[PDB]
Amino acid sequence: SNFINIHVLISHSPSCLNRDDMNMQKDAIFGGKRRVRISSQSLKRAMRKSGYYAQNIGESSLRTIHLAQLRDVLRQKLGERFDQKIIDKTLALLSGKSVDEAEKISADAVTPWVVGEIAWFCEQVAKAEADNLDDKKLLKVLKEDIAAIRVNLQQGVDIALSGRMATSGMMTELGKVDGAMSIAHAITTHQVDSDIDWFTAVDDLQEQGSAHLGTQEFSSGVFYRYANINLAQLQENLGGASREQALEIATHVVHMLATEVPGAKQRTYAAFNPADMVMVNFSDMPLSMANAFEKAVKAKDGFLQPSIQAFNQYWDRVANGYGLNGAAAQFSLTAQVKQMPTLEQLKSWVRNNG
Amino acid sequence: SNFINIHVLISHSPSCLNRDDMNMQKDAIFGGKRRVRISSQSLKRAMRKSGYYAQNIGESSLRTIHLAQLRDVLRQKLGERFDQKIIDKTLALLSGKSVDEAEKISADAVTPWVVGEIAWFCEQVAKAEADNLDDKKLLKVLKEDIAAIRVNLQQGVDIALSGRMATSGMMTELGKVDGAMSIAHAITTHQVDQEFSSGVFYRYANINLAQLQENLGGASREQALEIATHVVHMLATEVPGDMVMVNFSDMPLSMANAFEKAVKAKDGFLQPSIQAFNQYWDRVANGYGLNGAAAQFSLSVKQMPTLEQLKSWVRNNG
Amino acid sequence: MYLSVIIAWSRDLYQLHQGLWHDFLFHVECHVLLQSAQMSTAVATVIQVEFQLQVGVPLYFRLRANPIIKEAEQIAWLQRKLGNAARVEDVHPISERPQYKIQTVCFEGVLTINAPALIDLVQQGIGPMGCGLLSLAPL
Incomplete structure (x- = not known):
């Protein structure tokens, strides 16, 4: 049972949690009908930058493209630990760019960094410098053992979970990370014809009408959040961490997925809703439950109840047809599915490997 | 806890409240049914322009985009305390637009302003002039201390509550304000197309206390709690043109999903609305293990006898 | 009383009432809703109640x-x-x-x-x- 699948039928309220360049709600055609959409990267950053992450998992990675700014940040944070030359050289070797007193140094693309990782590398560079070991041989011997660097990734779990991509520097050979997890886009269970808010900006110094006018798309929705954790990949991405540790990270993710909501336009629409259902299918191969809502769900006393009924029915069907055993454990507000009356009860059920 | 959640479940008429461009009453689809809606900005201007706000919180913010009539205004209000040149230079530097005798100067967008803050900036500009600080170097010096500017924001609370955006001038680095509040759009708990019944509206808001204290220059939790009480009242009463529930918490929480399944009742919506609120509340608090400080004022958790008792209760944390 | 109509016929409002005439109470839905005292022209194509009330x-x-x-x-x-x-x-x-x-x-x-x-x-x-x-x- 390598795969842990998280299904979340989080019901929401009127808002604009995620929009595009036209300031309009992101959407997606599914089942032939328009659904409101929240991009996976939005959920991922929402969780990554949340307080719960900061207190239950740790510090999130520093994703940047500016190497001058990163050079200064590192010179400050690691200045009492290493000499300036060591830090510079380490950054240059890791990025593939030359680090001098230039005000503008750009990496190839946006790259996620971890300060602990860079410190580790700085130690390596120091020792290599002492042994008169050139950067090629250094790259070789470093490439010989990857696990340690992934411990240094124990200090940046968002990377270990959602992967990293390199195109320059030693990172190419040393920092290529394949994401542990796997997270879908957020899709609404039902057809949505979005509403438009006609807004106005009244000038307290204008005799005529408002100084500004406009529109803003918004709507409510019963979304379906899906994610899974690849787990073995997680243990690997953290330096060979224990299965228990991985399950801890996974439970944290479950909680956030049932809890965290993108802070977009919430200051004026406030859709601070909790998940009205969580279902953590412990399993063997990644299995999404989105097809439960392929046939768009029609409202019968709200959208929530028939959404959940659909989810459960389809889950029973897939479980029966593909002989899909393995731990289940739902949770809400099929007998093989242990019912959990509390979220914490579910999380503890997951920590205990189902 | 840091987040205070306000759930003013009001009740009145579903007409002549908020209009769009076609002069129709604003609405929204929730639970697959039509609800009558009042926009958050509507509630916000209604609150910040009402008399209660003027008596308890203070003066509202001057929201404008016309900078010519504005420089006129600050000239004929700060005429004595500062030189003409200094006031002109202050507005210019602050907005980025070069001030003149133009009678037609516009900012990038409609922004809220506070007179006292501008006066403070004028003081710093005076110090600059006497000591001859470069506008760039001056900008550096000012960047060093934002909190002071935020106590100048203590003058204009609606800004500290609902934030301010800037895309030009010195303001860009000194005037960016993240709103402390967060107010949902008011919607009905029931389908608005059996006897006649007045609509019942679920209003939600919350306040991020720490952010409020930060936006006011590092004020105490007490002051923030007081302003929070004022907002509780204004949201519980005011109507543009019954049941209250304040509750402390670690992360913001809205009760709108209680009315996802639209409330149906053949003779009055308020009671099944309150029962829905209670049911969903119990299910949520039990399910997510929340034990924050409650305070429910209803006439049908620490119950409360009146609205003022709840007000004071809030003023004293738990 | 008769409730009933598609007025093409929507030149001016004038032509509307002049059309249905070929008094009664219309009210547009152009398309139309039509109340009349009596119960179909090529200018106006048609697509009975006395309520009890209380x-x-x-x-x-x-x-x-x-x-x-x-x-x-x-x-x-x-x-x-x-x-x-x-x-x-x-x-x-x-x-x-x-x-x-x-x-x-x-x-x-x-x-x-x-x-x-x-x-x-x-x-x-x-x-x-x-x-x-x-x-x-x-x-």
Whole structure:
């Protein structure tokens, strides 16, 4: 049972949690009908930058493209630990760019960094410098053992979970990370014809009408959040961490997925809703439950109840047809599915490997 | 806890409240049914322009985009305390637009302003002039201390509550304000197309206390709690043109999903609305293990006898 | 009384009433809703009720009218013109776009009933071009 699948039928309220360049709600055609959409990267950053992450998992990675700014940040944070030359050289070797007193140094693309990782590398560079070991041989011997660097990734779990991509520097050979997890886009269970808010900006110094006018798309929705954790990949991405540790990270993710909501336009629409259902299918191969809502769900006393009924029915069907055993454990507000009356009860059920 | 959640479940008429461009009453689809809606900005201007706000919180913010009539205004209000040149230079530097005798100067967008803050900036500009600080170097010096500017924001609370955006001038680095509040759009708990019944509206808001204290220059939790009480009242009463529930918490929480399944009742919506609120509340608090400080004022958790008792209760944390 | 109509025929409002004529109370949906005292032309293609009613019964209502701007004045106008046929129970006055001048206003909402006067008021219309028809519905 390598795969842990998280299904979340989080019901929401009127808002604009995620929009595009036209300031309009992101959407997606599914089942032939328009659904409101929240991009996976939005959920991922929402969780990554949340307080719960900061207190239950740790510090999130520093994703940047500016190497001058990163050079200064590192010179400050690691200045009492290493000499300036060591830090510079380490950054240059890791990025593939030359680090001098230039005000503008750009990496190839946006790259996620971890300060602990860079410190580790700085130690390596120091020792290599002492042994008169050139950067090629250094790259070789470093490439010989990857696990340690992934411990240094124990200090940046968002990377270990959602992967990293390199195109320059030693990172190419040393920092290529394949994401542990796997997270879908957020899709609404039902057809949505979005509403438009006609807004106005009244000038307290204008005799005529408002100084500004406009529109803003918004709507409510019963979304379906899906994610899974690849787990073995997680243990690997953290330096060979224990299965228990991985399950801890996974439970944290479950909680956030049932809890965290993108802070977009919430200051004026406030859709601070909790998940009205969580279902953590412990399993063997990644299995999404989105097809439960392929046939768009029609409202019968709200959208929530028939959404959940659909989810459960389809889950029973897939479980029966593909002989899909393995731990289940739902949770809400099929007998093989242990019912959990509390979220914490579910999380503890997951920590205990189902 | 840091987040205070306000759930003013009001009740009145579903007409002549908020209009769009076609002069129709604003609405929204929730639970697959039509609800009558009042926009958050509507509630916000209604609150910040009402008399209660003027008596308890203070003066509202001057929201404008016309900078010519504005420089006129600050000239004929700060005429004595500062030189003409200094006031002109202050507005210019602050907005980025070069001030003149133009009678037609516009900012990038409609922004809220506070007179006292501008006066403070004028003081710093005076110090600059006497000591001859470069506008760039001056900008550096000012960047060093934002909190002071935020106590100048203590003058204009609606800004500290609902934030301010800037895309030009010195303001860009000194005037960016993240709103402390967060107010949902008011919607009905029931389908608005059996006897006649007045609509019942679920209003939600919350306040991020720490952010409020930060936006006011590092004020105490007490002051923030007081302003929070004022907002509780204004949201519980005011109507543009019954049941209250304040509750402390670690992360913001809205009760709108209680009315996802639209409330149906053949003779009055308020009671099944309150029962829905209670049911969903119990299910949520039990399910997510929340034990924050409650305070429910209803006439049908620490119950409360009146609205003022709840007000004071809030003023004293738990 | 006869409820019924597709007016092509929408040149001017003039041609509308002139068309249906070939008095009665239309009210547009152009497309149209049509109330008449009697029960199909090539200029107007057609696509019977006398309600029982009761006293003190709530009924949704809609009405295009010509109040001759203020919301207060509009609602007061409505309750005045409604007379003692029915107490207004709730109403929203939609300030419609001017027609060709005629400044129509659409009163949509719910009445409580205070009965025959109401019937006569329906079959006679309200106010000074599509205006005047009071549409009623239960709940």
